[PDB]
Amino acid sequence: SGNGAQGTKFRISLGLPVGAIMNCADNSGARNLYIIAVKGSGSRLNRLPAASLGDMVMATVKKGKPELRKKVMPAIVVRQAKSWRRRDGVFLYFEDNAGVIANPKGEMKGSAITGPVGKECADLWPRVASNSGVVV
Amino acid sequence: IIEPSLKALASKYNCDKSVCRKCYARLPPRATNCRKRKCGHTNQLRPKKKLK
Amino acid sequence: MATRTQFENSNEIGVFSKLTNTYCLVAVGGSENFYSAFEAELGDAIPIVHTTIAGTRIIGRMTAGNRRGLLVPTQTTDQELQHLRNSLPDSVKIQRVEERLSALGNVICCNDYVALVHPDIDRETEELISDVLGVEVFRQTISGNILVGSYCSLSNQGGLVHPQTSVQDQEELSSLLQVPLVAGTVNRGSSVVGAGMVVNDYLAVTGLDTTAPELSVIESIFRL
Amino acid sequence: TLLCCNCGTPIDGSTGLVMCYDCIKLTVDITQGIPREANISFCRNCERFLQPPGQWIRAELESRELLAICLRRLKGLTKVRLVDASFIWTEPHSRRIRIKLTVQGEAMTNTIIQQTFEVEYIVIAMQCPDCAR
Amino acid sequence: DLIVPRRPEWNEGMSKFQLDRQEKEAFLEWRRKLAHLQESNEDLLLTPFERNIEVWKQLWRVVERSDLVVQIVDARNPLLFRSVDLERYVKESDDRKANLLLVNKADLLTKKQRIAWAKYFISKNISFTFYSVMEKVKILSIDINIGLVGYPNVGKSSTINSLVGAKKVSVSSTPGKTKHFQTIKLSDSVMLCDCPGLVFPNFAYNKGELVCNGVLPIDQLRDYIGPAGLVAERIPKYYIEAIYGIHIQTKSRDEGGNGDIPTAQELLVAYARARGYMTQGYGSADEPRASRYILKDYVNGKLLYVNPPPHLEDDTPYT
RNA sequence: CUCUUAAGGUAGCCAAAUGCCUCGUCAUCUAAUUAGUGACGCGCAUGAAUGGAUUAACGAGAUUCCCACUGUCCCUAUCUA
RNA sequence: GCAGUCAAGCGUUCAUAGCGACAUUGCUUUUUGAUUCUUCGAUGUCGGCUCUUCCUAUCAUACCGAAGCAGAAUUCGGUAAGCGUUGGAUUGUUCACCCACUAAUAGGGAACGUGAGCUGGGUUUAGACCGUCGUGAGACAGGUUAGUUUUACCCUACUGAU
Ligand SMILES: [Zn+2]
Ligand SMILES: [Zn+2]
Ligand SMILES: [Zn+2]
């Protein structure tokens, strides 16, 4: 999990499992990301791994810039639709699951993030915060 | 900084020993007969490696 | 002087800290040597305040301050605001902004006497900014990267940009600001230059990985 | 208008680039994790070479499926967008095959560079076990 | 500068194993000549040639006894099909020789643009014919061994029908079939020696290629983008639109990334969507599959295009 | 020229519901494919009304891929007779 | 399949740090075979799903020893089976191969565990198609497609209950 993570997170409701196809905010030409795996993600029979906000995933592009697709690449999810709980009590959610392409060291490939971003990702991945314009 | 007057002492308890070829157990350098029973009190010993 | 440190293990100091000619800001993650890049470089010249706005440690890219004012987003709470009002002078005018963006330090590149703002900022913040900081604005671009305060550090005496910056745009911003600048990367070839460091008149701060050929251009362009 | 940040002196372009060509040639490497000399097996009667587990591909010496077998062999070349895989001439009676490879490895951030490197393939005689008026 | 070695000194002797040794040594020198070019011309621009020795050892049994040869070459682009070192090669032995090379497959061109190529030879003293001085428009097949030779697939196995016309040898879609040379005899005065499959190397227009128009198989090609790009460069889009009956794009990328006359990445994204061929894992256009069906139509004769002979011309072919 | 008493697989087609070796080879689809498609064909053992090849339309026929869809699944819960 | 004993040598020198030929001693019944005792008035016969328990010849985790152990990383060995040992493409698959996460992706048994527990893709009735064989009926452990999966209310066991 700590492959570029500055800090360490609380548990967030695991929204989108593998097979999920979430948008891509970064300005790297992509349009969607097919999650194939998750860092962390222990094992249980017949359980398929899941990704929460702030988690790293390993991903596969389906639409955008054939230079990119047909290969795996790390990614960082920054919006999810599953209502999750903050320690201040409130349950929040976004309107779409969306992510970012990234390198294993937690850095990014793109120069911006088209949309809002979760504090539970941005505190943790710092190179995302410098490229985000909005946080929640 | 170990001042080899004292390096000799540390080596008495660390690196002046003899080891079984059959159980890999620290034994004294003068002794035969590995004291452990699972080896069968054998006599196949060697010195411990100190140079290269 | 470029006093290099890492926050915890991250070389991105303009994320976690902020520094100007009257104060400095830092987050809550320990690593006392990191504080010893200012507590060792400053006497009692100015204060260093430890804060976590909104539960966030990322002070620099959420906040946006100057010599006579600090801009602070909407989500921040009165209790992270109260210590920030007390342990600073009464000179700086604090003000919770009530606009749509939040990462103010990724849209603003402010020094004491000029600024640069993200294009689609609120036109009410367009004037709040000059009423609280007393500074002008020019909300155009850097090289196409709308996020200006992350891809440009600033002092009054110098400037810095990423290496993709067109030499036409470099001289453009020079003609804007009456400050020099260079297409200088940081932290061993990073493009997030606004976050890889925080600069003042006499003090620069980068990451431990930041290398001497980068310090060379930094001390040149910023000190004078 | 920049400076290298490693060598320092050079003012490189503004297309999106990284530290100077000499430093990225010397320090930065994108061809690590490959054995330069690669071993293969061969018989003089059956003339059926193989990847270490495999049925005999039946191709001839100095053919096109040597590329397929040599790439199928476990190196790092399969992972990084190969192109231009030709066969360099070698002495027939040296019993080694010489092939250059190019990989499109990404630099520090979204900047591509061309690479010129080479692998040599040594072949050892075998009785080819399945085979054995 | 050289494309064929020398084949000297037969002398009607013995040592069956040695008359092929001497050929092997003419080949070792030929292979050495081919190798030093890679250090000379950069070190990436390679060439299309037959690595195997037996294929040229076959070609060496079918000309010295042929005694008169003709050179089939398509009328699409003779420039990279003209053989450079035949004139320097079959002239020396002082016997039945002098090919007088030809250009052929001259039924896919308009009439005003055939003198446009006939005039490329009125200046430079070259032999030719037009068969699929001014008293000549076009004449059919009316116009001792002999031989026919071609790049690969120029119609060497389809102009066997110029003599008898019953398809005595198989014509295929792939070029890699003809080999193990065939011989045809008729009329009891003339003989043939139908060659095996060939290519010929080259150094100009090496890697940037429209050479993949008749030379290589279209199927087992891992690039799919270069030749498709050079296809999209030519043949303006307001003909491909009217022929295929599909509205692809309007080229919104009007900036310095793509420009006008779109390249072969935005042209094929809406075509496999019109033809439904979708990937195995997501619904998106499969350009690596869609390029092949378009290139096959480009090569077979559904889309035509011919090349200006000597120099820089914007638009010589008028469809 | 011949050998087997007659002839000696023409046109066409294919790892095909016919191909053992075989998860054949190459390309493609996929992150990954013993599958699928196209192509190659000395084809154990294709083949011309024991009909070959191609074929619009049709099919409760066999098969692969995609868009949409969903408790099929992640991972179970609840309600009614 | 696993292990051991001599130890000619490899091992920059250094048989045995590690490995180790020529020979030689055994263990195992998770292979295949041989045999034919039981079962032909029938013990429901591939695989997967589910679920529990056991074994150790330990993949990981704990404490230790030894190295050709500087550190880092690795290998050899020991007590040890308490705890865990995956998601997926292709295949009916056992088996296998790849992608990927992971601390790790160890092997095995229980009537080759488990069909009155499921499924029924495969195989193994009947319909039908091709190839090869045969004069032919018809054959093929060759390929393809379709093809009824019954009963528990008893005794015991188990779970709970008086
Ligand atoms: Zn012992
Ligand atoms: Zn340099
Ligand atoms: Zn053999």
PDB file of C-alpha atoms in Angstrom, chain C residues 22-113:
ATOM      1  CA  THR C  22       6.326  37.939   7.842  1.00  0.00           C
ATOM      2  CA  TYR C  23       5.579  34.316   8.745  1.00  0.00           C
ATOM      3  CA  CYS C  24       5.823  30.617   7.955  1.00  0.00           C
ATOM      4  CA  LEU C  25       3.352  27.742   8.063  1.00  0.00           C
ATOM      5  CA  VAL C  26       3.843  24.034   8.658  1.00  0.00           C
ATOM      6  CA  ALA C  27       1.868  20.843   9.084  1.00  0.00           C
ATOM      7  CA  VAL C  28       1.612  18.238  11.838  1.00  0.00           C
ATOM      8  CA  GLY C  29       3.868  15.304  10.999  1.00  0.00           C
ATOM      9  CA  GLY C  30       6.856  15.711  13.279  1.00  0.00           C
ATOM     10  CA  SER C  31      10.287  15.072  11.803  1.00  0.00           C
ATOM     11  CA  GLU C  32      11.883  17.831  13.871  1.00  0.00           C
ATOM     12  CA  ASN C  33      14.730  18.244  11.380  1.00  0.00           C
ATOM     13  CA  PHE C  34      12.150  19.559   8.916  1.00  0.00           C
ATOM     14  CA  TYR C  35      11.277  22.313  11.373  1.00  0.00           C
ATOM     15  CA  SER C  36      15.035  22.789  11.799  1.00  0.00           C
ATOM     16  CA  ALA C  37      15.141  24.124   8.220  1.00  0.00           C
ATOM     17  CA  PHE C  38      13.517  27.314   9.530  1.00  0.00           C
ATOM     18  CA  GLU C  39      14.048  27.247  13.307  1.00  0.00           C
ATOM     19  CA  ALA C  40      17.733  26.905  12.421  1.00  0.00           C
ATOM     20  CA  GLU C  41      17.551  29.526   9.638  1.00  0.00           C
ATOM     21  CA  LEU C  42      15.377  32.000  11.553  1.00  0.00           C
ATOM     22  CA  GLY C  43      16.120  33.550  14.898  1.00  0.00           C
ATOM     23  CA  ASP C  44      13.048  35.231  16.356  1.00  0.00           C
ATOM     24  CA  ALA C  45      12.684  37.097  13.057  1.00  0.00           C
ATOM     25  CA  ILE C  46       9.224  35.703  12.301  1.00  0.00           C
ATOM     26  CA  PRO C  47       6.932  32.906  13.545  1.00  0.00           C
ATOM     27  CA  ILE C  48       6.312  29.366  12.390  1.00  0.00           C
ATOM     28  CA  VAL C  49       2.760  28.120  12.964  1.00  0.00           C
ATOM     29  CA  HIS C  50       1.709  24.445  13.004  1.00  0.00           C
ATOM     30  CA  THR C  51      -1.761  23.904  11.541  1.00  0.00           C
ATOM     31  CA  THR C  52      -4.027  21.400   9.815  1.00  0.00           C
ATOM     32  CA  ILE C  53      -6.784  23.269   8.024  1.00  0.00           C
ATOM     33  CA  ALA C  54      -9.911  21.219   7.399  1.00  0.00           C
ATOM     34  CA  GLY C  55      -8.168  18.154   8.792  1.00  0.00           C
ATOM     35  CA  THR C  56      -5.699  18.510   5.923  1.00  0.00           C
ATOM     36  CA  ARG C  57      -1.971  18.707   6.392  1.00  0.00           C
ATOM     37  CA  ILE C  58      -1.556  20.232   2.918  1.00  0.00           C
ATOM     38  CA  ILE C  59      -1.296  23.864   3.904  1.00  0.00           C
ATOM     39  CA  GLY C  60       0.419  25.209   0.837  1.00  0.00           C
ATOM     40  CA  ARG C  61      -1.880  24.083  -1.953  1.00  0.00           C
ATOM     41  CA  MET C  62      -5.032  24.900   0.004  1.00  0.00           C
ATOM     42  CA  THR C  63      -3.961  28.314   1.345  1.00  0.00           C
ATOM     43  CA  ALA C  64      -2.519  31.409  -0.335  1.00  0.00           C
ATOM     44  CA  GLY C  65      -0.732  34.100   1.663  1.00  0.00           C
ATOM     45  CA  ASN C  66       1.421  37.225   1.411  1.00  0.00           C
ATOM     46  CA  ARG C  67       3.089  39.800   3.641  1.00  0.00           C
ATOM     47  CA  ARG C  68      -0.152  41.515   4.709  1.00  0.00           C
ATOM     48  CA  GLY C  69      -2.785  38.827   4.337  1.00  0.00           C
ATOM     49  CA  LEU C  70      -3.666  35.162   4.106  1.00  0.00           C
ATOM     50  CA  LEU C  71      -6.400  33.606   1.986  1.00  0.00           C
ATOM     51  CA  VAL C  72      -7.909  30.458   3.429  1.00  0.00           C
ATOM     52  CA  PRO C  73     -10.585  28.169   1.918  1.00  0.00           C
ATOM     53  CA  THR C  74     -14.198  27.681   2.996  1.00  0.00           C
ATOM     54  CA  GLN C  75     -13.982  24.199   4.491  1.00  0.00           C
ATOM     55  CA  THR C  76     -11.588  25.262   7.230  1.00  0.00           C
ATOM     56  CA  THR C  77     -12.924  25.346  10.756  1.00  0.00           C
ATOM     57  CA  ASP C  78     -12.979  28.087  13.358  1.00  0.00           C
ATOM     58  CA  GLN C  79     -10.641  26.154  15.660  1.00  0.00           C
ATOM     59  CA  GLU C  80      -7.958  25.682  13.002  1.00  0.00           C
ATOM     60  CA  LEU C  81      -8.599  29.366  12.225  1.00  0.00           C
ATOM     61  CA  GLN C  82      -8.340  30.686  15.786  1.00  0.00           C
ATOM     62  CA  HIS C  83      -4.817  29.512  16.533  1.00  0.00           C
ATOM     63  CA  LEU C  84      -3.945  30.799  13.064  1.00  0.00           C
ATOM     64  CA  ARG C  85      -5.304  34.251  13.970  1.00  0.00           C
ATOM     65  CA  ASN C  86      -3.682  34.319  17.401  1.00  0.00           C
ATOM     66  CA  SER C  87      -0.196  32.960  16.721  1.00  0.00           C
ATOM     67  CA  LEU C  88       0.201  35.391  13.820  1.00  0.00           C
ATOM     68  CA  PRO C  89       0.347  39.193  14.096  1.00  0.00           C
ATOM     69  CA  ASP C  90      -2.672  41.425  13.625  1.00  0.00           C
ATOM     70  CA  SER C  91      -1.021  42.760  10.448  1.00  0.00           C
ATOM     71  CA  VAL C  92      -2.141  39.851   8.264  1.00  0.00           C
ATOM     72  CA  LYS C  93      -5.816  39.906   7.394  1.00  0.00           C
ATOM     73  CA  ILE C  94      -7.228  36.383   7.532  1.00  0.00           C
ATOM     74  CA  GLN C  95     -10.420  35.675   5.619  1.00  0.00           C
ATOM     75  CA  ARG C  96     -12.350  32.465   4.973  1.00  0.00           C
ATOM     76  CA  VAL C  97     -13.208  32.700   1.296  1.00  0.00           C
ATOM     77  CA  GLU C  98     -16.623  31.474   0.163  1.00  0.00           C
ATOM     78  CA  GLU C  99     -15.851  30.574  -3.466  1.00  0.00           C
ATOM     79  CA  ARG C 100     -16.030  27.329  -5.432  1.00  0.00           C
ATOM     80  CA  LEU C 101     -12.426  26.218  -5.746  1.00  0.00           C
ATOM     81  CA  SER C 102     -10.540  25.207  -2.618  1.00  0.00           C
ATOM     82  CA  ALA C 103      -6.918  24.588  -3.577  1.00  0.00           C
ATOM     83  CA  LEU C 104      -6.085  28.283  -3.495  1.00  0.00           C
ATOM     84  CA  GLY C 105      -2.347  27.660  -3.653  1.00  0.00           C
ATOM     85  CA  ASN C 106      -2.782  25.780  -6.919  1.00  0.00           C
ATOM     86  CA  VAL C 107      -4.574  28.719  -8.594  1.00  0.00           C
ATOM     87  CA  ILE C 108      -2.727  31.673  -7.030  1.00  0.00           C
ATOM     88  CA  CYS C 109       0.939  32.615  -7.468  1.00  0.00           C
ATOM     89  CA  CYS C 110       1.179  35.614  -5.150  1.00  0.00           C
ATOM     90  CA  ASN C 111       4.156  37.625  -3.981  1.00  0.00           C
ATOM     91  CA  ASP C 112       4.105  40.947  -2.152  1.00  0.00           C
ATOM     92  CA  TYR C 113       3.453  43.167  -5.184  1.00  0.00           C
TER      93      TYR C 113
END
